[PDB]
Structure 1
Amino acid sequence: EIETFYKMLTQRAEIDRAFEEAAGSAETLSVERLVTFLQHQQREEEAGPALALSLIERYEPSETAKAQRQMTKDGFLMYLLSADGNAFSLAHRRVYQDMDQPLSHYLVSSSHNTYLLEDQLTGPSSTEAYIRALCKGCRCLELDCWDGPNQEPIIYHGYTFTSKILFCDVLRAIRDYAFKASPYPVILSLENHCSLEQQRVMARHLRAILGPILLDQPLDGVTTSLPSPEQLKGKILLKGKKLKLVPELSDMIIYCKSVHFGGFSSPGTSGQAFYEMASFSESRALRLLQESGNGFVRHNVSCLSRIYPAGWRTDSSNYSPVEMWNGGCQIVALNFQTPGPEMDVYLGCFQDNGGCGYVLKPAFLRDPNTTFNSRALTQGPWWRPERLRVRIISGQQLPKVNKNKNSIVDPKVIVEIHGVGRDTGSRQTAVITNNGFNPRWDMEFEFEVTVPDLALVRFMVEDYDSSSKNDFIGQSTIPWNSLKQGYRHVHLLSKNGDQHPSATLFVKISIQD
């Protein structure tokens, strides 16, 4: 009991089995057996003694086995539960992409009416809202500037009852957190409703507060294209209307001149300049994607486009970002304050590339002559069907999904594919009743993904309830190319995107062609 209970509660057959398999007769894994596991099961490409040894060095608890270049079942588990055993590629959790292309080649973490903490009509505004977003890696922030008392511009949602805050206060906060999560450029989208004088105050504050961080002049040689994230490292740039508008402000707009959508076109006569940016509401963007997906795509190759939520989303609900990324849209602004599958997917995408806020787009979306249209799929580079098999084995210590303290979770898991329309899919396990500690599903799903480069796999765990809506227990969204194979643990996040240190799913993933 003292142990029985102890080790029995803390016993994981699925782990036992996996170990046994990799180990066979033996009670330990030799480097050779380990390397075999890494290759055969984990499909590691760097599978070899070096990797095996570092895994052992890092995770093997037994001094004996460690010294003797072996891995025990315990070390096996530890590796599996570590950052290396994470279904989300540890390698992609650092900046590894090419950060030297023009801004228009990356998806950019962007937020909508960043100052808001709640709804769009009467909820509060706060510098905190900016800090939170920035801490979540957001790169493109929104500032709605209005004239305030004492000649100090304030920020709030025009024509609503949303609380107000100061423009300067907002700038200081931004100043302080702009690069906490990433060193890459922050872009301030200014929606300017200020009088000429207050605009002057804006410019003053900008300069005074941002100081050298502020990009107030074109970079050298930045001639034909937008600068790259690298070239703009440590800088904050302004997006807004450029010469009703004082030059003080207007002159600070260098690479993001807010423009009205004209249309798309081959030459340089009618598809704005690389330093011109159009914004589209969700509704309008959809229509354009619906009618001219390829034009938009091609358009997005060398131009930044911003999309923002539909006006009816006064509750600050969010739309799916994927549908906009599928069109090459880079500044897909969501309401960062709102928990949901949308921000889940959003933050999943941006966890990629070191979480720096700039994720390089697939090459075919960086090809000015692509014929891609996520909506009307034809043969091309983007076509690379893969077969994904995901086995949801078990769950460990699922968070008590907010009830009180006497009901036990009745967990079930949902796995979804997000990507081009033809790839979207969703499957769910059965419900395990009254077990959040170590529910065991042992269910496998299989999906066919034709445009993996645009796909994300999401794991959501819910607390089933016949009576009511199933409670959301935890979630994890992984960009396709960061999805690791073999036995892995999916580390569950809360509604707010926070880590659940011990909440995981143990899965087995396989991706075949």
Structure 2
Amino acid sequence: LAEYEKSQIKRALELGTVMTVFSFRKSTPERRTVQVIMETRQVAWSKTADKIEGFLDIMEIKEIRPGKNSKDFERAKAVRQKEDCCFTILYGTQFVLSTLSLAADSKEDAVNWLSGLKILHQEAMNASTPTIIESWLRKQIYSVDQTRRNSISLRELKTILPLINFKVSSAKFLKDKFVEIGAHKDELSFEQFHLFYKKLMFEQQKSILDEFKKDSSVFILGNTDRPDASAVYLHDFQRFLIHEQQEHWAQDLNKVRERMTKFIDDTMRETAEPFLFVDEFLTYLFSRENSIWDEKYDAVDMQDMNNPLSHYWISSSHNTYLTGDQLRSESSPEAYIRCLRMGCRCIELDCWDGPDGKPVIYHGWTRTTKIKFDDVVQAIKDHAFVTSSFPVILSIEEHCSVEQQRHMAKAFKEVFGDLLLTKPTEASADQLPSPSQLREKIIIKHKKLGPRGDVKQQGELYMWDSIDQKWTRHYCAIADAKLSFSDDIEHFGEKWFHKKVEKRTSAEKLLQEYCMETGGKDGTFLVRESETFPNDYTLSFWRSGRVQHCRIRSTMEGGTLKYYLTDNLTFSSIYALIQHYRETHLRCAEFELRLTDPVPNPNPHESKPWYYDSLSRGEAEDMLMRIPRDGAFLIRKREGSDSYAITFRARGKVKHCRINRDGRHFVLGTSAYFESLVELVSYYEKHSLYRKMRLRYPVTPELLERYNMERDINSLYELEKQIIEDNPLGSLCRGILDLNTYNVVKAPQGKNQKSFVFILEPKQQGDPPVEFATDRVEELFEWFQSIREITWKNQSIAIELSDLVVYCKPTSKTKDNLENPDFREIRSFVETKADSIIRQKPVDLLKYNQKGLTRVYPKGQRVDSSNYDPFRLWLCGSQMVALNFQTADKYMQMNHALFSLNGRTGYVLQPESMRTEKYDPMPPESQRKILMTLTVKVLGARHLPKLGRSIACPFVEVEICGAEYDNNKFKTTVVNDNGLSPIWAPTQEKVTFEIYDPNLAFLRFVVYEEDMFSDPNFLAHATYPIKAVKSGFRSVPLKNGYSEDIELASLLVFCEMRPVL
């Protein structure tokens, strides 16, 4: 397409168009105008032009599809729109892709939308770092005010600075910086903001550039590293690339010129020698251009795809249809789609019985929802080979009847056509084919016919807790005569009313302080109680730069009260006056003024029952000991100190925390600011303070009496980890109780306002009952009988589908023995059994692997969808290691690192050395030998994300993911409250990692932060195969938990790989 057509399409997109938007939250779809913003690179859908409502980062668009094949388009209202008109964007950094579904009025308009979208996405992923830096700055500016203005104020800048995860040092250096940039009068045009931003990080972390200076060798930078802007010249930059970076393509000068021209991306900079500013240089060292990842491994290396399939680590997943935990998660085809587009080449289908006759998929004997099989197989067909043409392997755990798998195989054939594999590629071959030979083919793995041609209750029940006095839905299962259940599945009262505030002087001081810290307005108000006028309120209202005071007048009329001001505007509910005075100004004989600001009392927590005015530390621990529940908390004003404190029981231990006061704000630890205590508790009820615990349960004396009434709660009591392994709920089991000791009796009419309940009636009569409740009376009676016994040709496989499987045939006839490996067999191992095999016979497992296929899947005790350690299996060559793709663990980030290679094709060829007969997978101590040393020194970071209200205090852990001998860790000194521009100690030295198996070893950079309680939390990761790590000063792009890149997140590290000679 010509450039002018592209520009026209992009301009039409920039203008925007009224397009119907669909979502699950609204039954009726909504007409919101959608427009792309080049400045922020965001597809925003909104009603009014002044303010944008929807936000959509363009670089986070993972895939755009036409048609109505999405979760949103199931409301049955999109029938009117033609199929070609409708389209859907999938975007986000989570496994579940938040979907934005639109329906264009014109099919041509939809076509331009799709084409321009694709062009915009390609430009975004191809956009240089300064352009996306400018886009992110415009993002922040658009965030501070919704009017899309290009100006930001000093106060607004102070509001935004901790949002970008950086703290204000003294609030006076900030004004000094203001002066230096030249911005004046508390105003910032976008260019001034950009220059201030550059100056900010450059001043914060110019000490890094110093190391790029170091001493002797080649002096790339001179001594011009001061704040003053300085240039890096073309010859100097190419010298740096040749020496420090050791880049081959850097040998030619034209390549270096192109790299500079693309990076800077400035029309003005057309001079013969492009120049890199020292600030631009520091940005470059933190860019995607200097990524430690080697681009050559993104290219699909064909000659490594000539080998037989048995020699390839294969991308695979365990129950991929599940988007979360194994028990109750939503199962959606988008899970399969995101896995296949992710780089996976094996997806597990636990096809089950079909209600109408058409099979469905859902994790066995759980509450996970079901999806119609035909849709699933359509999704596989449509998105199997869009990202990778290499073959996929559909592992099947069948559970349906004969006719059901007959229909399943029929649907397979009909939807797949020539794409499916139905015959061996090489009939006379004695080994598995190559992925290249199997390109654009689909293998089906499933139990075939026999050698001669012949072949617990889980539910979401209600929990009644006397302390809670409300029913809580808990997921419960029964095993080994015990029941294990998880955690939970889920004027006077207004702002402007202040009542007993001491004096008009006191109230006017309150309003004046609130104004001078923020939000000074005209005629702004405050409702107080007059110390002089009887029984009358007082609307004391600041007056356009000054504070005044007038009493809310009052007269009795019509049997009711009538408050008023000047006797002209009279009402009975204070909202009426405040609002009517806000929209239309009060007109007193002196002024026409309106109101803005309601301010809660200095001590509003007084009204909250959970506040205790003054309780000693020992007594606080006393009550906290009387309450066994986790999540209990009470706030107390510490005697003799203006500062406050909050006490909470976590993990059975009572913990005190101190809250300080900074102005009107309450600061927690040293970085989190909250206007009022009630705001703090409301926020922390929906967020986490310690570990995963949240402030759920307040502590009130009236509730404390009932606490004293009943104090027995059954709970989980590495032994606890062993108990976790035993119970069916795994780590999710929050409560476990022996059902033998409880002689159940079914409640006839239930209790506590529920339709269906049953009584436990423990054998020891003093023990308190629990009384679980169910949704269905039949479910109730089935559970009840469950505790009752707790007290006391073809046979199974369809012929056609068994004809379908031609490779990866499942055999357990040889059982634990791996003798006589033939290429057509599949081995399915549970992680425990696989680890036992690898510990007993490591060599034999590889000897099978070079000839036959091995599939390993995690055990059922991992209902939390956690992923086990796969390194040992791969080191033995276990080709199919299936992990849950919906989770985020170190091991799955390891899998992503390993399988990004080869163009995320899913097939990674094992090295020839591992495939030699002489080589042994697990080497003893004497046979192990160092073969490459690696020196890593972290230098700084950028744009480390923000988890909660508290400003992150980051420290970097660099470690070698690998076997027991390759595992080595490095921690760095924590930086205090500096996340956007953190400078780790330039004095700290470089670590030395000895590497034994460079063919499979992982360099992992992870960023954690120290919370208020000094417990590390996960911020971002970067996992890389050590064969893909480059030398020099390189910037790793940090990724969130799900291996998706975070904008501008980057760590600069000096890495040197010296092979052992």
TM-score of the alignment, normalized to the shorter chain, above 0.5: yes
**1:122-164 CA distance string (max 9 Å, x none):** 3332212212212221110000111211111111112333222
The 2-side partners of 1:425 and 1:200 are apart by: 52
- State the partner residue of 1:249: 801
Taking the TM superposition and a 5 Å limit, the aligned residue runs for 1:124-203 are 124-203=330-409
Once the 2 structures are TM-superposed, how far is the Cα of residue 173 of structure 1 from its aligned partner? 1.3
SS in 1 for 2:356: helix
2:252 to 33, 44, 49: 49
Please name the residue that 1:491 is paired with. Answer: 1037
Q: In the alignment, which of 786, 803, 820 is matched to residue 271 of structure 1?
A: 820
Please give the alpha-carbon distance, in whole angstroms, between the structure 1 residues aligned to 2:966 and 2:1019: 25
**Corresponding residue number in structure 2 for 1:59:** 263
1:213–1:378 distance in 2 versus 1, CA, 3 Å: farther
Instruction: Specify the SS of the correspondent of 1:223.
Output: coil
Aligned match for 1:502, one of 1014, 1035, 1048: 1048
Q: Aligned in 2, Cα 1:466/1:372: closer, same or farther, shift over 3 Å?
A: farther
Structure 2 partner of 1:299? 848
Map of 1:436 onto structure 2: 979
- Contact 1:419 1:452 survives alignment (8 Å): no
- Work out whether 1:115 is the aligned partner of 2:661: no
After TM superposition, the structure 1 = structure 2 runs for residues 292-371 of structure 1, keeping only pairs within 5 Å, are 292-367=841-916, 369-371=917-919
Q: What is the SS of the residue equivalent to 1:512?
A: strand
Q: Post-superposition shift, 1:378? A: 5.8
- In 2, Cα distance between equivalents of 1:332 and 1:205: 28
Which range moved further: 338-347 or 465-474? 465-474
Contact 1:65 / 1:72 at 8 angstroms: preserved in 2?
Answer: no
**Post-superposition offset of 1:28:** 4.7
State whether residues 808 and 825 of structure 2, in contact with CA within 8 Å, keep that contact through their aligned partners in structure 1: yes
Q: For residue 40 of structure 1, what is the amino acid of its counterpart?
A: H
Q: Secondary structure at the residue paired with 2:398?
A: strand
**Higher mean C-alpha deviation, range 134-143 or range 66-75:** 66-75
State whether residues 850 and 915 of structure 2, in contact with CA within 8 Å, keep that contact through their aligned partners in structure 1: yes
Amino acid in the other structure paired with 1:464: E
Q: Name which of structure 1's ranges 52-61 and 312-321 shifts more when overlaid on structure 2.
A: 52-61
Structure 1 gaps of 5+ residues are none
> Is the contact between residue 288 and residue 1037 of structure 2 (CA under 8 Å) also seen in structure 1?
no
Deviation of 1:52 (Å): 3.3
* Offset of residue 71 of structure 1: 4.7
Residue 33 of structure 1 deviates from its aligned partner by 3.4
Change (3 A) 1:458 1:302: same
Separation in 2 of the partners of 1:29 and 1:126? 52
Q: Give the secondary structure class of the aligned counterpart of 1:417.
A: strand
Any conservation in 1 of the 2:938–2:984 contact (CA below 8 Å)? Answer: yes
Looking at structure 1, the residues matched to 920 and 432 of structure 2 have their Cα atoms a distance apart, in angstroms, of: 23
Name 2:810's counterpart in structure 1: 258
Q: CA offset at residue 456 of structure 1?
A: 0.5
Q: Matched residues in 2 for 1:491 and 1:42: separation?
A: 17
The 1:100–1:324 alpha-carbon spacing in structure 2 relative to 1, beyond 3 Å, is same
Confirm or deny: 8 A CA contact 2:201 2:981 kept in the other structure: no
Greater mean deviation of Cα atoms: 371-380 or 110-119: 371-380
Amino acid at match of 1:490: V
Give the residue type in structure 1 aligned to 2:285. Answer: L
TM-score normalised by the chain length of structure 2: 0.45
Q: 2:240 maps to which residue? A: 37
Superposed CA offset, 1:432-483 (max 9, x none)? 1111111111443221111121100111111212526422111110000001
Deviations 1:350-387 (A, max 9, x none): 111111111111212222x133122536658xx55211
Contact 2:348–2:395 under 8 Å retained in 1? yes
Contact in 2 for aligned 1:219/1:227 (Cα 8 Å): yes
Deviation >3 Å, runs of 4+: 2-7, 18-21, 25-36, 50-54, 60-66, 69-84, 261-265, 377-380
* Aligned residues: CA RMSD: 2.4
Q: 1:70, CA displacement in angstroms?
A: 5.6
Determine the C-alpha separation between the residues in 2 that align with 1:233 and 1:434: 51
Shift of 1:324: 1.3
Residue type at the aligned position of 1:246: A
* C-alpha separation in 2, matches of 1:35 and 1:82: 17
Contact 2:423 2:806 survives alignment (8 Å): yes
Which residue pairs with 1:8 in the alignment?
199
- Within 1, Cα distance between the matches of 2:364 and 2:271? 63
Matched-pair contact (CA < 8 Å) for 2:352–2:398: yes
Displacement of 1:309 in angstroms is: 0.5
Matched, 1:376 2:920: no
Cα distance in structure 2, aligned partners of 1:184 and 1:162: 31
Q: 1:430 to 1:25 in 2, by over 3 A?
A: closer
CA 1:247–1:468: 2 relative to 1, 3 Å: farther
Deviation at 1:264, TM superposition (A): 5.9
The DSSP-based 3-state class of the residue aligned with 1:94 is coil
Distance of aligned partners of 1:138 and 1:77 in 2 relative to their CA distance in 1, 3 Å threshold: same
C-alpha contact 1:110 1:332 (8 A) present in aligned 2: yes
Name the counterpart of 1:512.
Answer: 1058
Q: Distance in 2 between matches of 1:136 and 1:305?
A: 22
Shift of 1:410: 0.6
What is the CA deviation profile of residues 376-412 of structure 1, one whole-angstrom value per residue up to 9, with x for unaligned ones?
Answer: 36658xx5521111111111110012x13xx211101
Name the CA shift for 1:384/1:208 in 2 (closer, same or farther; >3 Å): farther
Tell which has more relative contact order, 1 or 2 (C-alpha 8 A, sep 6+): 1
Comparing 95-104 and 499-508, the one that deviates more = 95-104
CA contact (8 A) 1:326 1:419 kept: no
Q: How does 1:397-412 map to 2 (within 5 A)?
A: 397-401=943-947, 403-404=948-949, 407-412=950-955
TM-superposed CA distance for 1:203, in Å, is 0.4
Task: Work out the CA distance in 1 between the residues paired with 2:286 and 2:903.
Answer: 20
Structure 2: distance between partners of 1:342 and 1:19:
34
Unpaired runs of 5+ in structure 2? 1-176, 182-195, 214-218, 225-229, 450-795
425-434 or 78-87: which moved more?
78-87
Amino acid at match of 2:243: H
SS at match of 2:322: coil
% identical equivalent positions: 39
SS of structure 2 residue aligned to 1:336:
coil
CA spacing shift, 1:370–1:83, aligned 2, 3 Å = farther
TM-score, normalised relative to structure 1: 0.91
Q: 970, 979, 1004: which one pairs with 1:427?
A: 970
Relative to structure 1, the CA distance from residue 79 to residue 228 in structure 2 (aligned partners, 3 Å threshold; closer, same or farther) is: farther
Q: Structure 1 339/55 Cα, relative in aligned 2: closer, same or farther at 3 Å?
A: same
**1:87 to partner: Cα distance:** 1.1
1:103 matched to which residue of 2?
309
8 Å contact kept, 1:145–1:154: yes
TM-aligned CA distance change 1:67 to 1:299, over 3 Å = farther
Cα contact 1:392–1:508 (8 A) shared by 2: yes
Query: Residue 113 of structure 1: CA displacement?
Result: 0.6
1:329, distance to aligned residue in structure 2 (A)? 0.6
C-alpha distance in structure 2 between counterparts of 1:276 and 1:506, whole Å: 47
